Write a protein that binds this ligand. Sequence first.
Ligand SMILES: COc1ccc(Cl)cc1C(=O)NCCc1ccc(S(=O)(=O)NC(=O)NC2CCCCC2)cc1
Ligand SMILES: CC(C)CCC[C@@H](C)[C@H]1CC[C@H]2[C@@H]3CC=C4C[C@@H](O)CC[C@]4(C)[C@H]3CC[C@]12C
Ligand SMILES: CC(C)CCC[C@@H](C)[C@H]1CC[C@H]2[C@@H]3CC=C4C[C@@H](O)CC[C@]4(C)[C@H]3CC[C@]12C
Ligand SMILES: CC(C)CCC[C@@H](C)[C@H]1CC[C@H]2[C@@H]3CC=C4C[C@@H](O)CC[C@]4(C)[C@H]3CC[C@]12C
Ligand SMILES: CC(C)CCC[C@@H](C)[C@H]1CC[C@H]2[C@@H]3CC=C4C[C@@H](O)CC[C@]4(C)[C@H]3CC[C@]12C
Ligand SMILES: CC(C)CCC[C@@H](C)[C@H]1CC[C@H]2[C@@H]3CC=C4C[C@@H](O)CC[C@]4(C)[C@H]3CC[C@]12C
Ligand SMILES: CC(C)CCC[C@@H](C)[C@H]1CC[C@H]2[C@@H]3CC=C4C[C@@H](O)CC[C@]4(C)[C@H]3CC[C@]12C
Ligand SMILES: CC(C)CCC[C@@H](C)[C@H]1CC[C@H]2[C@@H]3CC=C4C[C@@H](O)CC[C@]4(C)[C@H]3CC[C@]12C
Ligand SMILES: CC(C)CCC[C@@H](C)[C@H]1CC[C@H]2[C@@H]3CC=C4C[C@@H](O)CC[C@]4(C)[C@H]3CC[C@]12C
Length: 872
Amino acid sequence: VGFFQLFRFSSSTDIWLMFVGSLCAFLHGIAQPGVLLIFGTMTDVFIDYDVELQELQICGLLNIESEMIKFASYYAGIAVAVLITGYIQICFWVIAAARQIQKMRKFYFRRIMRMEILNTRFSDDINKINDAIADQMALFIQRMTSTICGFLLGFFRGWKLTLVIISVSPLIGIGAATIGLSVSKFTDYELKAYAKAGVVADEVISSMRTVAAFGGEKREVERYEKNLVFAQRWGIRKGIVMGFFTGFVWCLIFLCYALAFWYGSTLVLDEGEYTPGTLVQIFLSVIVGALNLGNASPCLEAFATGRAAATSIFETIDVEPAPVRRILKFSAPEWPYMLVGSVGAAVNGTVTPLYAFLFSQILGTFSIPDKEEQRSQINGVCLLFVAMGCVSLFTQFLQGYAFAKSGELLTKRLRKFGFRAMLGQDIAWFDDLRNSPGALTTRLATDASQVQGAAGSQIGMIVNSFTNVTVAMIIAFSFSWKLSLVILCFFPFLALSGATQTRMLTGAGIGKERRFIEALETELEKPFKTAIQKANIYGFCFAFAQCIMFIANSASYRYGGYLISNEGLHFSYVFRVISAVVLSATALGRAFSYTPSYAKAKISAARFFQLLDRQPPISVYNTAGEKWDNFQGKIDFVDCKFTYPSRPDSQVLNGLSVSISPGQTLAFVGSSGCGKSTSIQLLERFYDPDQGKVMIDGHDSKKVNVQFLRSNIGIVSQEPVLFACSIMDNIKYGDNTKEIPMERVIAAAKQAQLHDFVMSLPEKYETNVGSQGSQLSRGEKQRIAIARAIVRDPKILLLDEATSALDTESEKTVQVALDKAREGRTCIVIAHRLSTIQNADIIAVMAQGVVIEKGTHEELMAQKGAYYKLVT
Ligand SMILES: COc1ccc(Cl)cc1C(=O)NCCc1ccc(S(=O)(=O)NC(=O)NC2CCCCC2)cc1
Ligand SMILES: CC(C)CCC[C@@H](C)[C@H]1CC[C@H]2[C@@H]3CC=C4C[C@@H](O)CC[C@]4(C)[C@H]3CC[C@]12C
Ligand SMILES: CC(C)CCC[C@@H](C)[C@H]1CC[C@H]2[C@@H]3CC=C4C[C@@H](O)CC[C@]4(C)[C@H]3CC[C@]12C
Ligand SMILES: CC(C)CCC[C@@H](C)[C@H]1CC[C@H]2[C@@H]3CC=C4C[C@@H](O)CC[C@]4(C)[C@H]3CC[C@]12C
Ligand SMILES: CC(C)CCC[C@@H](C)[C@H]1CC[C@H]2[C@@H]3CC=C4C[C@@H](O)CC[C@]4(C)[C@H]3CC[C@]12C
Ligand SMILES: CC(C)CCC[C@@H](C)[C@H]1CC[C@H]2[C@@H]3CC=C4C[C@@H](O)CC[C@]4(C)[C@H]3CC[C@]12C
Ligand SMILES: CC(C)CCC[C@@H](C)[C@H]1CC[C@H]2[C@@H]3CC=C4C[C@@H](O)CC[C@]4(C)[C@H]3CC[C@]12C
Ligand SMILES: CC(C)CCC[C@@H](C)[C@H]1CC[C@H]2[C@@H]3CC=C4C[C@@H](O)CC[C@]4(C)[C@H]3CC[C@]12C
Ligand SMILES: CC(C)CCC[C@@H](C)[C@H]1CC[C@H]2[C@@H]3CC=C4C[C@@H](O)CC[C@]4(C)[C@H]3CC[C@]12C
């Protein structure tokens, strides 16, 4: 509706509190163009003094010392003005914002409970409306004032140089807008590209028992690594486009600098209506205005989100980040692409010190007596600007492409390795409710893409800042080291102006409806006190950050004037040293603000490594065991005790002492829960026994290879989970290993009572399963599952309550297929339904799991069994 409707207050105190802060923000915004005007005056004074100095060695009533103490005093006064004004802005704005937001929360809470008979998102929505109103609207006003006044005095002092700079501004505007649009477009494209690999991951992890039972760990990994390339390539494309566009923006900026300096030089030398100080003032003022306009996009983003969340509440009224040293170790194969990226960082790190050097050269060449040599030097510096712009284009593009490629390769490798590790875990690891299909998929998709922040981009920005600081120090200490040390004294504070920014930013009936009107109002004193203390400390930090640059400039320029009056050094050297050191300090301060991504990436890397470095009790990838000759399935149960660590409901899981010879059926019929499916897990070694032994053969379960054991058992789950690849991929999947011919599949299909149906389809055998086909009937996917179970020719069958189809017509087909699937082989079938013949085996398991009944269809009459219990 409007961000002016947020402040519903006619209260005088809040309005005046906001008004004073807004006035001080306006004054602070005024300060920077004014200090730039003073800077232009100094530049004019320096140039005039240098000209007279050169003339005197081939007027004089200037006394550069007096002018420089006057300018330094003006700078100190502006510094204290900035300190006071910024303190007022932050303190008053955040205090008033906290007051109004707590009043709104109080009104909301008093209004919700009195009426006829997403909450913490609300807390975060009020959080964001207070965020839109506390400091975003003060900084926005200050930056708007800064840019408007910068453009205004740029026009006022000279209306042509600012005119051409404005005329060249749009191309940069179009480039920035296109970059902003691409930020979201490529995010959407990357999500669409990764959708397929994510779908594969969810399909595999969702049904992990089936994947592990058939030993299809390698096949799913193969599918995942095959599908990951389509998202890796889109990551590469986004990276290269972004790098090229940022290089284009940088090259355009440097071309603008060259054009402005050539045009200003022509105006100053030929026409003469511009003095060089006016040129410097105009250029710096327009640059400051552009920077302030660019920096306001965040603030406008906040304003938007906040109006939005009050549009949300307007009608409710009226484990350890320790390991990082191994991230490089894990990223060893991508050593060249990072190295090349480092070359991109080490080259584009020098652009700021070189820009300071070239600006100082332009300033110092304005005192050259020769007009033609002046023009030649200016032309040379403009050509250097053009060359540096082109170099920045190429280097930014190359750095972006290389680091995006390294990050995407690392993400793909991490995703594949994490998927392999997840597939290698035991079944119990998937029931913790902290490693869930959704959470595991999130870890595969998001965390791996996040580790690249600590891996590649972090190294790049570190190298960029290190090279920036090194080159700036080399420039500063090679011309005047004394002034270099003087400004280096303020260097740590200038860096901390941005380094500590994040560290401080991130830090009805029976009820009488009248008791709670008083227990809530007094509760909000402490949040108000902490808010006002935080606002005061924020104000002090922000005011110090804003005024430290002015103080440093004042002191350094006073000392530079002293040096010029005493030591025979150019003013251009003073400008060079001071500007280079200040810019390097700003860059370094921007560098240490890396925590919001670096800490998250380190947490992500730690979680992965913890997942990868886990040794499970039952390792499918382990080759430990002893059973090899003539498998027959002489399964035996001895006093097996199970606690079921997922849920301690039936920790007394004992009484199972059955043992069947090879070729014997064994039906487990008992209660509806905790007596049906546990032995399935024990036979599959999904969980190892705790206080019992499962004696599969001459050797026990705990000491037989899991791969070999699962290879000999055919599993038919309760619900038939089938992959969406193909019928062949869903029938030959049972023997996922080699030695699978197109034969032995026709026999399995015939034995599964499916060959006629699979023959009826036009796509006879290459039919695709899923939403792209017609197989939704249970009595057909169940038959494909049974076929997949039988093609491996397993000695043991593990029916797990199949034939759960409502239509009896399909039930008869699946049950006759299962009956033809046994053919005198060991099996443990769970059948709540009475379809299975009771002559298969004896009813022995009760609710507790105790095994007592053993007689062949004659002890079930004296003792309550399956049918005898139901008939009473
Ligand atoms: C002070 O510029 C220079 C003078 C000479 C040279 Cl070779 C380079 C620069 C330079 O740095 N070019 C980078 C672009 C730039 C500069 C300043 C600002 S700024 O934010 O307006 N600076 C202040 O507010 N501090 C003032 C500056 C004047 C003295 C008193 C303190 C914003 C952007
Ligand atoms: C824009 C710069 C250059 C000039 C200074 C602007 C100041 C005076 C503006 C900026 C934001 C403004 C406030 C924005 C919204 C409201 C809510 C409305 O219900 C009453 C007026 C009030 C409280 C405004 C008072 C004036 C205000 C503080
Ligand atoms: C809040 C109290 C303590 C201080 C108020 C600070 C105000 C009045 C100061 C801060 C910066 C100052 C400006 C800085 C530089 C210039 C350029 C000069 O050629 C004319 C004056 C002018 C435009 C100043 C006007 C007054 C000014 C806006
Ligand atoms: C319009 C956008 C894309 C920015 C580009 C504008 C350029 C091409 C314009 C802006 C100012 C112009 C200059 C203004 C005045 C002079 C003086 C003399 O030497 C003749 C040409 C020359 C040097 C012009 C050449 C073209 C020029 C440099
Ligand atoms: C395309 C938009 C962004 C404007 C960029 C134009 C820039 C790169 C162009 C416009 C005018 C050009 C100048 C025109 C003429 C000369 C004189 C020659 O002896 C040396 C190069 C020099 C000094 C050129 C340097 C590059 C220059 C400043
Ligand atoms: C050109 C200069 C400035 C920087 C060069 C790049 C440096 C900082 C970085 C970029 C990527 C880094 C490599 C990334 C990963 C590994 C694998 C592991 O065994 C640790 C060392 C090693 C081999 C790193 C060595 C240092 C390295 C090459
Ligand atoms: C984005 C870039 C490529 C835009 C093109 C602008 C640059 C590359 C072009 C425009 C005009 C060119 C200048 C035109 C003429 C001369 C005079 C010659 O004796 C030296 C080279 C020099 C000074 C050229 C250097 C390159 C130049 C500045
Ligand atoms: C890393 C950054 C932030 C700070 C580095 C400060 C270093 C480079 C400074 C601190 C003290 C300095 C020295 C102080 C005095 C002299 C004596 C004379 O011969 C000039 C150079 C020399 C020898 C300086 C060289 C640079 C120096 C060693
Ligand atoms: C590395 C940073 C923090 C600087 C640390 C040293 C600072 C605090 C001190 C130690 C030695 C000092 C210098 C010693 C001698 C002189 C000569 C005299 O004309 C005063 C300025 C000057 C040039 C001093 C400037 C300040 C100085 C550089």
